Amino acid sequence: THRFVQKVEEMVQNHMTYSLQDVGGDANWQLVVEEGEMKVYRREVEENGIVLDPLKATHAVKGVTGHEVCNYFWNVDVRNDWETTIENFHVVETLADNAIIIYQTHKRVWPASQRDVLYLSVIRKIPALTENDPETWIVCNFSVDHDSAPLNNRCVRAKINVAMICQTLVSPPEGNQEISRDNILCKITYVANVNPGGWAPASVLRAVAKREYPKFLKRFTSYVQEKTAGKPILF
Numbered sequence: 001t002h003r004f005v006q007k008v009e010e011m012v013q014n015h016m017t018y019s020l021q022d023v024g025g026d027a028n029w030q031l032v033v034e035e036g037e038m039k040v041y042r043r044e045v046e047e048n049g050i051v052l053d054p055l056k057a058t059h060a061v062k063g064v065t066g067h068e069v070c071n072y073f074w075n076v077d078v079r080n081d082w083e084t085t086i087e088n089f090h091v092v093e094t095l096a097d098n099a100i101i102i103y104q105t106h107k108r109v110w111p112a113s114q115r116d117v118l119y120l121s122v123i124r125k126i127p128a129l130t131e132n133d134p135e136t137w138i139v140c141n142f143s144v145d146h147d148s149a150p151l152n153n154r155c156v157r158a159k160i161n162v163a164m165i166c167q168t169l170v171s172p173p174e175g176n177q178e179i180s181r182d183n184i185l186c187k188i189t190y191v192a193n194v195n196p197g198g199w200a201p202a203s204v205l206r207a208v209a210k211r212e213y214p215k216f217l218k219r220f221t222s223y224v225q226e227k228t229a230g231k232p233i234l235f
Ligand SMILES: O=S(=O)(CCO)c1ccc(-c2ccc(C3CCCC3)c([C@@H]3C[C@@H]3c3ccccn3)c2)cc1
Pocket: 085, 106, 109, 112, 115, 117, 141, 158, 160, 162, 192, 194, 195, 196, 200, 208, 209, 212, 213, 216
């Protein structure tokens, strides 16, 4: 269908295999911020003196489904309503109705150079592995090469592997009556592995992540709740 079908399958399954695991009981993850059901963890990792710190967060969001949260996360048309760190983005290629390649630049984090990034963004529904398990909706954004990447002399090229992974729990339907948003809960696992791609001072990157990831999770999840309130549910 397109040349990244196989790569998308591998990235998506790697997340299904490894990113969903619980880390509440795992001392290898440091719990760095908690704000109610929002739990943000990371591991301190450097390669060549450059911070890579794997970031993993869980959250539980009332009144929205995983399909909704993934649609709003993936849909480039609403990106600017919730995103606060992007300076410019351009859709570089459409691969399928569920997969695009995006070029974007991020607001500079002083005193490091601005970063840019070039990634495939894909949204998939992953069927329940057994009839006992929840279905999953996942967006994965992972860096790829491309010939129509911009020359941007201000920016160092970061590389990312991010996933927003959602499972949705509902009260079952009571005969012929729909499920209300009061009875739905979206369990989120969000993972972000970011390679700044060059020099950046470690303590500043760490302080910035510790502040901006929870701000992002809070703003984005509230944004989905606000936009879906009183709209029919899209399961
Ligand atoms: O969830 S997504 O796919 C949403 C689509 O954009 C995504 C999230 C985060 C990034 C990201 C890119 C660059 C940087 C750093 C690297 C060196 C200097 C800039 C960071 C650091 C961690 C801080 C950060 C955290 C959360 C949101 C934005 N910024 C994060 C990219 C994509």
